[PDB]
PDB file of C-alpha atoms in Angstrom:
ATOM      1  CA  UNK A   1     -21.776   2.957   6.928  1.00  0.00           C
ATOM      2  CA  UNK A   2     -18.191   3.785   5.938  1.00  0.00           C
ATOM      3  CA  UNK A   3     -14.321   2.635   6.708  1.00  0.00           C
ATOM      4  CA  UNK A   4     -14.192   1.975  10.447  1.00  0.00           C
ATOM      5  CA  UNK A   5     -11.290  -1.038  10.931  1.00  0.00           C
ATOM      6  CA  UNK A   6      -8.690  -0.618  13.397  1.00  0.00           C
ATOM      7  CA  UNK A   7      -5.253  -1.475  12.472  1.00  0.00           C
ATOM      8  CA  UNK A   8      -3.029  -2.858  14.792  1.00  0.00           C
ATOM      9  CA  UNK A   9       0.981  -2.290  14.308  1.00  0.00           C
ATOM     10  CA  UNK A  10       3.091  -5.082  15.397  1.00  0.00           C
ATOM     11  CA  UNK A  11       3.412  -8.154  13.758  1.00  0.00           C
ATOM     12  CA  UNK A  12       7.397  -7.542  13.348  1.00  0.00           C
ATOM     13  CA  UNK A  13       9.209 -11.115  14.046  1.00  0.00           C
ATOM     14  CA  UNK A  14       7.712 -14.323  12.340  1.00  0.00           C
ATOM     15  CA  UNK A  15       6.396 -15.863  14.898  1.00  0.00           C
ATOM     16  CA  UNK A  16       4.196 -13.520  15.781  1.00  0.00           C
ATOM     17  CA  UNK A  17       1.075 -14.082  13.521  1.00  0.00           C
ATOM     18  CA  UNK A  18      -2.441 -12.159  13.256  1.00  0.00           C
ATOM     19  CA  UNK A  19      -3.691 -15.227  14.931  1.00  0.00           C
ATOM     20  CA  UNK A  20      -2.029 -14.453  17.836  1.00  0.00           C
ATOM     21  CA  UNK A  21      -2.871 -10.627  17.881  1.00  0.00           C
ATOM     22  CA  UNK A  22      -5.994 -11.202  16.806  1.00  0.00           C
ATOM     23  CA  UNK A  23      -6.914 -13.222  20.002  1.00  0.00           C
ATOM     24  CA  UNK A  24      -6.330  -9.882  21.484  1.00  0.00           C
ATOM     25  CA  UNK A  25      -9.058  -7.752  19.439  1.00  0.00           C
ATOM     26  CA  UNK A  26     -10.669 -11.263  19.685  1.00  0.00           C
ATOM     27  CA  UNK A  27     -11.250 -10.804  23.250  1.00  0.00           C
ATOM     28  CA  UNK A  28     -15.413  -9.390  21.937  1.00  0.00           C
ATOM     29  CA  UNK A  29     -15.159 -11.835  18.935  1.00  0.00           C
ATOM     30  CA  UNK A  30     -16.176  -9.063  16.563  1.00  0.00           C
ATOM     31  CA  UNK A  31     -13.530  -8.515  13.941  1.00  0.00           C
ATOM     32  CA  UNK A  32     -15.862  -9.870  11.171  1.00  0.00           C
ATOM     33  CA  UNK A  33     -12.299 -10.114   8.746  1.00  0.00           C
ATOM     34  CA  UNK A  34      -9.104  -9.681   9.287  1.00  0.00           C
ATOM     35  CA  UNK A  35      -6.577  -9.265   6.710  1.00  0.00           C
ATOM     36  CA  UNK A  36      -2.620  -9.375   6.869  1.00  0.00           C
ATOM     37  CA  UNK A  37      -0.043  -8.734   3.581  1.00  0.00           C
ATOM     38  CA  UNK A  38       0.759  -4.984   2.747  1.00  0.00           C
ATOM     39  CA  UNK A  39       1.255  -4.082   6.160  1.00  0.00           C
ATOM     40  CA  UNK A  40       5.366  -5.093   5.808  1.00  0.00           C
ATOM     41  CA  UNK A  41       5.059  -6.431   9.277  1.00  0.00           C
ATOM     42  CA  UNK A  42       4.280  -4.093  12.305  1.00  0.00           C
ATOM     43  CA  UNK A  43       0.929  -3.402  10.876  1.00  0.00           C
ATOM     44  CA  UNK A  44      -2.604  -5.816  10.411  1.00  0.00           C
ATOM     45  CA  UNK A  45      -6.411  -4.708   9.437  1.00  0.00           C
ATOM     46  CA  UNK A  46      -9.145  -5.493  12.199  1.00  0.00           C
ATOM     47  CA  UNK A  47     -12.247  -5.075  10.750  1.00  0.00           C
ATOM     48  CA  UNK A  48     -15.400  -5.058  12.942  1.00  0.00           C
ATOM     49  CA  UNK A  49     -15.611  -1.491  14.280  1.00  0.00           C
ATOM     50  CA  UNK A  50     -17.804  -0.087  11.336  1.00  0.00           C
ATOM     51  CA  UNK A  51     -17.802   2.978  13.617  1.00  0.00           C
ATOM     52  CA  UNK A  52     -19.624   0.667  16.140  1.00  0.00           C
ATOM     53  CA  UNK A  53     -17.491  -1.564  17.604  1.00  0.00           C
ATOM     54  CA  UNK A  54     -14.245   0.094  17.664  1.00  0.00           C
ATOM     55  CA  UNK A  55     -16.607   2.096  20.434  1.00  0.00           C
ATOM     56  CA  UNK A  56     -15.811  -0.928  22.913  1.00  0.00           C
ATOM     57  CA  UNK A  57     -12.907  -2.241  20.930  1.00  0.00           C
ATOM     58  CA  UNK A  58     -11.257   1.315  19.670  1.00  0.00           C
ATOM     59  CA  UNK A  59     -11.584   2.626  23.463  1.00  0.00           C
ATOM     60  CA  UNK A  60     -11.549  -0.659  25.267  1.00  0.00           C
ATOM     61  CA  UNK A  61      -8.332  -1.618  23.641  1.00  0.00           C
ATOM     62  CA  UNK A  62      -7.073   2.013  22.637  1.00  0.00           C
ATOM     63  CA  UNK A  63      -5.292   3.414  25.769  1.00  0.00           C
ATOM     64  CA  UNK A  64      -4.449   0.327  27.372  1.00  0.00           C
ATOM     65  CA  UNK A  65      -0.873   1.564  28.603  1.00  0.00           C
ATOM     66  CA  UNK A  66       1.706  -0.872  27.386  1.00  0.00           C
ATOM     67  CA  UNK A  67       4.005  -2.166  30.077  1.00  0.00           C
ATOM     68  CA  UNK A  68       6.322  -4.608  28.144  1.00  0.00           C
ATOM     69  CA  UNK A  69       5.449  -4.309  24.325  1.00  0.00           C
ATOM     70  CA  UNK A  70       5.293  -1.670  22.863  1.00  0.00           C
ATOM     71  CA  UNK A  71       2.469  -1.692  20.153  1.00  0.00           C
ATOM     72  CA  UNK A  72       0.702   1.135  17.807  1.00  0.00           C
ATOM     73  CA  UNK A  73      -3.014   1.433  16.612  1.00  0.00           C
ATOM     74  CA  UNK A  74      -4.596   3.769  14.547  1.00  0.00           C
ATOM     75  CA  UNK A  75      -7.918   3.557  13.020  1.00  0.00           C
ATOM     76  CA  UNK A  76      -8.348   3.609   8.588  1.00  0.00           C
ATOM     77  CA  UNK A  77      -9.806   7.435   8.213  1.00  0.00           C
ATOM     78  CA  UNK A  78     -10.736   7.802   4.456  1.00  0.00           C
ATOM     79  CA  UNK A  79     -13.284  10.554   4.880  1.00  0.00           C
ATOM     80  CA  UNK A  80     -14.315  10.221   1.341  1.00  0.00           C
ATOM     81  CA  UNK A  81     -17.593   7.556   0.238  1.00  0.00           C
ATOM     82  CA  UNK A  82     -16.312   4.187  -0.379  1.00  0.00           C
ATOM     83  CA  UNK A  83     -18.443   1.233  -1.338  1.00  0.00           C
ATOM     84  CA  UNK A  84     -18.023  -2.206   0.441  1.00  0.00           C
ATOM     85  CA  UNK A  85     -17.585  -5.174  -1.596  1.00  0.00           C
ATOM     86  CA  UNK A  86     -13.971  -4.224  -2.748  1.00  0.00           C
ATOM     87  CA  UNK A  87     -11.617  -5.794  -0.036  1.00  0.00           C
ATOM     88  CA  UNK A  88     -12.722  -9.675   0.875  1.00  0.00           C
ATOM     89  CA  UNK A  89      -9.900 -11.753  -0.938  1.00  0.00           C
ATOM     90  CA  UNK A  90      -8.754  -9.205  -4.018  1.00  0.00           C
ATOM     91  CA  UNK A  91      -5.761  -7.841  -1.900  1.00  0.00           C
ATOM     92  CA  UNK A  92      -3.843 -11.057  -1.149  1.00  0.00           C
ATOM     93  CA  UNK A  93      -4.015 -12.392   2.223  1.00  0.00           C
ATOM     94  CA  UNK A  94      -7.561 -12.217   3.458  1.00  0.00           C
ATOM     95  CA  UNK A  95      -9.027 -14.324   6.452  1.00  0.00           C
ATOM     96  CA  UNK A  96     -12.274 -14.361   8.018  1.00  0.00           C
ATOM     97  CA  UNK A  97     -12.861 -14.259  11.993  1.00  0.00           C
ATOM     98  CA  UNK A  98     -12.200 -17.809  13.437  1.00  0.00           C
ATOM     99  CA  UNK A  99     -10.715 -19.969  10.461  1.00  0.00           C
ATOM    100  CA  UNK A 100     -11.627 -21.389   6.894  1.00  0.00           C
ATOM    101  CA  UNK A 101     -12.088 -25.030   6.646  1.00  0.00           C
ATOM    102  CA  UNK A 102     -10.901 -27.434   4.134  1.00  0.00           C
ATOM    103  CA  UNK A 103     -13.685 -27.217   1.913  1.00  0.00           C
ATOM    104  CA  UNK A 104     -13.202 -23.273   1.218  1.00  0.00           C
ATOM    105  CA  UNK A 105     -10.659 -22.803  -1.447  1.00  0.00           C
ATOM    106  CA  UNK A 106     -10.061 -25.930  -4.119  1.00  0.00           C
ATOM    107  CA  UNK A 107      -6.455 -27.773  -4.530  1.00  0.00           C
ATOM    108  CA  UNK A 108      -4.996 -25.298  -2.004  1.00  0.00           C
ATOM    109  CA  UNK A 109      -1.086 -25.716  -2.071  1.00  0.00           C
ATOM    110  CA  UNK A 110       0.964 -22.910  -3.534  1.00  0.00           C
ATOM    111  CA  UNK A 111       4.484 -22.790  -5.757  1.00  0.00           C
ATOM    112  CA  UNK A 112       7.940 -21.625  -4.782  1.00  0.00           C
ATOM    113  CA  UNK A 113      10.603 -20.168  -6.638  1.00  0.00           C
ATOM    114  CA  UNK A 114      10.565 -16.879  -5.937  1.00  0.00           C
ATOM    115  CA  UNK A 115      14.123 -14.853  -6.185  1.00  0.00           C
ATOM    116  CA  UNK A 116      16.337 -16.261  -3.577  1.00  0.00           C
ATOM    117  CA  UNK A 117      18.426 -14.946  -1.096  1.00  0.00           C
ATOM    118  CA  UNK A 118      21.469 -15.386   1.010  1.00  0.00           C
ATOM    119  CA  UNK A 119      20.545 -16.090   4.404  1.00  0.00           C
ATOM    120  CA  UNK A 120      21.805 -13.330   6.541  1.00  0.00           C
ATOM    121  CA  UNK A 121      21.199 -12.338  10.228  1.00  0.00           C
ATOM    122  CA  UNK A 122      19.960  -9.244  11.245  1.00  0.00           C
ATOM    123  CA  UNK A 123      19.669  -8.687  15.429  1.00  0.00           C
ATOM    124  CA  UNK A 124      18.181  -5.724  17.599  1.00  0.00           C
ATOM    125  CA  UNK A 125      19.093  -5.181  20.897  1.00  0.00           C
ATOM    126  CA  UNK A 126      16.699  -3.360  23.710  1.00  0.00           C
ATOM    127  CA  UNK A 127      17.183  -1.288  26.483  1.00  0.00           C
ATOM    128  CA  UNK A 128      20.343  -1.851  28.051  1.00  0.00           C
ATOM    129  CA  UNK A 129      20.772  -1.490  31.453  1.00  0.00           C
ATOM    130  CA  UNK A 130      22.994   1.016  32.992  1.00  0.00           C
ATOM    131  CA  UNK A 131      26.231  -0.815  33.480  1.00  0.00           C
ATOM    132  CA  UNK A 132      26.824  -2.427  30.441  1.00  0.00           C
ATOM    133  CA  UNK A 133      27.863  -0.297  27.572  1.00  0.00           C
ATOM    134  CA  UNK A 134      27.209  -0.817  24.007  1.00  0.00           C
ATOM    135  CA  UNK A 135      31.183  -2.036  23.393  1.00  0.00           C
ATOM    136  CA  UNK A 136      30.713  -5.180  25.818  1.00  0.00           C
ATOM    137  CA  UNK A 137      27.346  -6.395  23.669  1.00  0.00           C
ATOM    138  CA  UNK A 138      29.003  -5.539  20.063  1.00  0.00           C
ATOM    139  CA  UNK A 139      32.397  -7.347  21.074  1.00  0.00           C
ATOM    140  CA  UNK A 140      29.948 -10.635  22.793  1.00  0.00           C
ATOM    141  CA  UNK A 141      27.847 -10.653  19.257  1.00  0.00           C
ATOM    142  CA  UNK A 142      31.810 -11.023  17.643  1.00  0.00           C
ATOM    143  CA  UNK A 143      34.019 -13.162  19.705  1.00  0.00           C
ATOM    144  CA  UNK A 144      30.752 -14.622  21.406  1.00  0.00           C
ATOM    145  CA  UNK A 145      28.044 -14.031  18.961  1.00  0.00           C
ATOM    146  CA  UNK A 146      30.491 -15.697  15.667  1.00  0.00           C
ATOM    147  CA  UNK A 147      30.012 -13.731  12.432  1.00  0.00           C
ATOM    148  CA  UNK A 148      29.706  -9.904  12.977  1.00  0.00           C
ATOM    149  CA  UNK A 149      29.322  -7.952   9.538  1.00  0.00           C
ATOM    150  CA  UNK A 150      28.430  -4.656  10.987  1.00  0.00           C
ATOM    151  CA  UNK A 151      26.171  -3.170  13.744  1.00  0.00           C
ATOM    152  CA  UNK A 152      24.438   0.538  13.584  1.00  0.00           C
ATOM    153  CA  UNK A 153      23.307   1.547  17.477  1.00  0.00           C
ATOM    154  CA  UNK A 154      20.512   4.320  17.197  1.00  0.00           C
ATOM    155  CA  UNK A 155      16.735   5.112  17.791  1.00  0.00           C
ATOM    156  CA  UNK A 156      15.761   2.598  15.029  1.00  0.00           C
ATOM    157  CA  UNK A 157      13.378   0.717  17.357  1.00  0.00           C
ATOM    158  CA  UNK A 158      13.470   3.466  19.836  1.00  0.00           C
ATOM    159  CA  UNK A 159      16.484   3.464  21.932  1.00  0.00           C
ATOM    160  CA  UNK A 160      17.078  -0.050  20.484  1.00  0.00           C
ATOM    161  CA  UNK A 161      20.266  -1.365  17.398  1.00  0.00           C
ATOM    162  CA  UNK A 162      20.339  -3.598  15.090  1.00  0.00           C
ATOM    163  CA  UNK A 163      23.318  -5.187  14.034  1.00  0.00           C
ATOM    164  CA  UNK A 164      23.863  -7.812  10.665  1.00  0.00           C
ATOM    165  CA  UNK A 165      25.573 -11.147  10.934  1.00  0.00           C
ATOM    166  CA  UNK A 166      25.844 -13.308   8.078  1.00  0.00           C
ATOM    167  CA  UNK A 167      25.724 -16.828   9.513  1.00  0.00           C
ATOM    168  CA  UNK A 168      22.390 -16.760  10.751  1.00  0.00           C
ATOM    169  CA  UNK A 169      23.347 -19.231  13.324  1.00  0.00           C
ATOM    170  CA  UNK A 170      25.560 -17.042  14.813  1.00  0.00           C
ATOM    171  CA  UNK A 171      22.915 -14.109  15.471  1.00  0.00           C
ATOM    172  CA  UNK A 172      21.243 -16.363  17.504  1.00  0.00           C
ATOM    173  CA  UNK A 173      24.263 -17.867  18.989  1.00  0.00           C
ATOM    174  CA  UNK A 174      24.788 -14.518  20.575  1.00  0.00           C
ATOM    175  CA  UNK A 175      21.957 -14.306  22.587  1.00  0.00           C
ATOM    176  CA  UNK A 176      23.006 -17.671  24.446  1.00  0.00           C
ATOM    177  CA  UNK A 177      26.547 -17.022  24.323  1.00  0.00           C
ATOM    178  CA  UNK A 178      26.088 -13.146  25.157  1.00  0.00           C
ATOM    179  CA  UNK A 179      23.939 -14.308  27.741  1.00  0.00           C
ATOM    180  CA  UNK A 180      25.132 -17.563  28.516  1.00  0.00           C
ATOM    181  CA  UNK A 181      25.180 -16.751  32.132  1.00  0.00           C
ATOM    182  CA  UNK A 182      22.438 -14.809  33.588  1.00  0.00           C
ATOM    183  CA  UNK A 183      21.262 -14.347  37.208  1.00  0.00           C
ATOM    184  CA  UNK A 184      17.372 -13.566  36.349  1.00  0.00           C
ATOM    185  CA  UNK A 185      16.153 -10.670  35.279  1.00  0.00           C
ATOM    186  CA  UNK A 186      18.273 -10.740  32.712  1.00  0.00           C
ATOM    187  CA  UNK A 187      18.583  -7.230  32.541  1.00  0.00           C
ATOM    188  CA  UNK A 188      16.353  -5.317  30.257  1.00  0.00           C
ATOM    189  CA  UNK A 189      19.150  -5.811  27.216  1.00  0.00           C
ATOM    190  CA  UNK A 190      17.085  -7.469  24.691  1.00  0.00           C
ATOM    191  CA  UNK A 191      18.742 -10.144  21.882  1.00  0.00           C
ATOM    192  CA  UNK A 192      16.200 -10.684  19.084  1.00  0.00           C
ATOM    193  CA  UNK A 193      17.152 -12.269  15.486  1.00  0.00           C
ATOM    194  CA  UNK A 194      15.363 -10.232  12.755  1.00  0.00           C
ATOM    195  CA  UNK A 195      15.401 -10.695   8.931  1.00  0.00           C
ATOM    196  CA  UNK A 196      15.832  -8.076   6.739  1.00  0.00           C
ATOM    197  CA  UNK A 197      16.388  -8.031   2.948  1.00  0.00           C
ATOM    198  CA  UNK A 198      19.286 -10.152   1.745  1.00  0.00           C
TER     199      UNK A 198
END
């Protein structure tokens, strides 16, 4: 009986919750916690393995050949001895397969205030297909996209860019107004609005 949770890297936009990727692993129900908060996005804790389960869920879900997102797992090693009963609620976010009801915690509610600020925008594009260079895409996000502070094209999110627009708005405006006119596949040039720090 030792560390056996596999984490799952993802969780990168905002939208994209635990709950959702948890429905994933959830597919055997066995996760008996899951917890989400220092993984800075692109990382979450499945816990339900114990050595066991990741058995069917480590090889079940483990080479699983992504086709359209592409994800990383790994599973916690920690060869020393560690004792459970350290790591159900003392790290931050902790949540517990399924949901908590409304009689778990007391007043829930939290405060804001917090260090504020400015709201910038922060875009990555994908794969671009060959025909379209990077010049056409960086000129839409300006004259098309509206604010353009700066964009840096390199291997970031493999192959993929990310380029910083102030007005929020405007990173998004891009992808319509990039994109305004499609015929379908929409090529495999991907418009995504990120936030960074700032």
């Amino acid at each position: 009986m030792g560390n056996s949770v596999l984490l799952v890297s993802n969780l990168n936009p905002e939208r994209v919750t635990p709950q959702s990727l948890f429905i994933l692993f959830g597919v055997y129900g066995d996760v008996q916690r899951v917890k989400i908060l220092f993984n800075k996005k692109e990382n979450a804790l499945v816990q339900m393995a114990d050595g066991n389960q990741a058995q069917l869920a480590m090889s079940h879900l483990n080479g699983h050949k992504l086709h359209g997102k592409p994800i990383r797992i790994t599973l916690s090693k920690h060869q020393n001895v560690q004792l459970p009963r350290e790591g159900q609620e003392d790290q931050g976010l902790t949540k517990d397969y399924g949901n908590s009801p409304l009689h778990r915690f007391k007043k829930p509610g939290s405060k804001n205030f917090q260090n504020i600020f400015p709201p910038s925008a922060t875009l990555h594009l994908s794969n671009i297909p060959p025909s379209v260079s990077e010049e056409d895409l960086k000129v839409l996000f300006s004259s098309n996209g509206g604010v353009v502070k700066g964009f840096k094209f390199f291997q970031k999110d493999r192959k993929m860019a990310l380029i910083q627009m102030g007005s929020v708005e405007e990173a998004v405006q891009a992808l319509i107004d990039l994109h305004n006119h499609d015929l379908g596949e929409n090529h495999h040039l991907r418009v995504s609005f990120s936030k960074s720090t700032i």
